[PDB]
């Protein structure tokens, strides 16, 4: 029956890491290796699964995350990383097999549009009424920063600082964040996230053959 729809990936401006787009698939047939032949994969490292296996297994759900990402920040996009990307931008599950891919959009992939630059939330805290004490807001797994409400979808300058007033239910004070940037590259480089879940008598996201 039906085929898994990866099309959105190939058409638009992929968001920055902290605004990742997510496609969620059930009851479909996929050809992941076809998808990745459209790009220059620079890195493909999984956790509790393999590149070979993730292309050929049956799932209850396959979940795919995509965003613009500089290849020069490879060390921060890692299932073992403790940098700003897992702290404030993007964190995957530990209790499910996952994978992280680093690609480059080739010139003959012409429906993928570049943003001005790459930007990531380098700090997301919450300070108290004392305007000094800072309480980090670490991102949950599979979720966005609470501080994406105050960060522009693309940060104009390295170091820009954002602020918003909190009601007393949340402790008063401000929600505070700060952003860093990386110069856009000649070809758009991206990062992808894959997460699989296995079920009992309900594995319907299986490879096409």
């Amino acid at each position: 029956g039906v085929e898994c729809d990866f099309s959105p990936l190939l058409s638009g401006t992929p968001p920055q890491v902290y605004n990742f787009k997510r496609l969620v698939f059930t009851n479909c047939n996929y050809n992941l290796t076809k998808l990745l032949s459209l790009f220059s994969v620079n890195d493909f490292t999984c956790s509790q699964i393999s590149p070979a296996a993730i292309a050929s297994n049956c799932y209850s759900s396959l979940i795919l995350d995509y965003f613009s990402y500089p290849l020069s920040m490879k060390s921060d996009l890692s299932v073992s990383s403790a940098g700003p990307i897992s702290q404030f931008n993007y964190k995957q599950s530990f209790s499910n097999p996952t994978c992280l891919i680093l690609a480059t959009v080739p010139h003959n992939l012409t429906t993928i549009t570049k943003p001005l630059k790459y930007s990531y939330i380098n700090k997301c805290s919450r300070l108290l009424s004392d305007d000094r004490t800072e309480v980090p807001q670490l991102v949950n797994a599979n979720q966005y920063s609470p501080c994406v409400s105050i960060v522009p979808s693309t940060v104009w300058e390295d170091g820009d600082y954002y602020r918003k007033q909190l009601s007393p239910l949340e402790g008063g004070g401000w929600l505070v964040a700060s952003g860093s940037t990386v110069a856009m590259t000649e070809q758009l480089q991206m990062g992808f996230g894959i997460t699989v879940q296995y079920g009992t008598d309900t594995n319907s996201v299986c490879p096409k053959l």
Partner: antibody
Amino acid sequence: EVQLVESGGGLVQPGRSLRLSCAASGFTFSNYAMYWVRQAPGKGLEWVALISYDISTDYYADSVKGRFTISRDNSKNTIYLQMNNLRTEDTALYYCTNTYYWGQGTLVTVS
Amino acid sequence: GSQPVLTQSPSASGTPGQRVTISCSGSSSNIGNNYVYWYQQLPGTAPKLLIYWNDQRPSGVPDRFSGSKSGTSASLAISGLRSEDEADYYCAAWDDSLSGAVFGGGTQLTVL
């Protein structure tokens, strides 16, 4: 581990007085607003009072304005809810929270 | 208990595995400029935070729970509806008019 223990609850005649406590552990207390929520048996939760982490401002429900007082001590990681001229509508289970963790309540009965 | 500022239509039906939502409606002084929190309470137990800051999920809550906030109303959707989901579900938010927090009427879901 995060724990939140109330006390003080009990029996009082209408219009009497009753002081509640709530001790906390397992987090940085001086970072959270703390507040009291009550539940009359078989009914919904109703917000009672809130006090900031600086013994700042306090907030009250119109049901309890002028009678209740919320207090706070950061050296003991403790909260107080003073209740005066209590009434039959003050019968409830008294919960103490930040937002993430709740406590097993304490009983307030009056009739 | 004198009527809450929030309207929580309290009946919520479904079936195992179904998706039931809980609609919490209010006014522009509470939902609309303030964050929503969602709570779950089992028969005779303390409440538990499910969703905070309208969409956020504390680690420990199953992924089946998620929250959203449009302009004036907020809702808690549940996928893969289970049997431990038989509980009472409440929304809450700050109110700039009362300068106090507001809870909803409280919905009870029953599913089997």
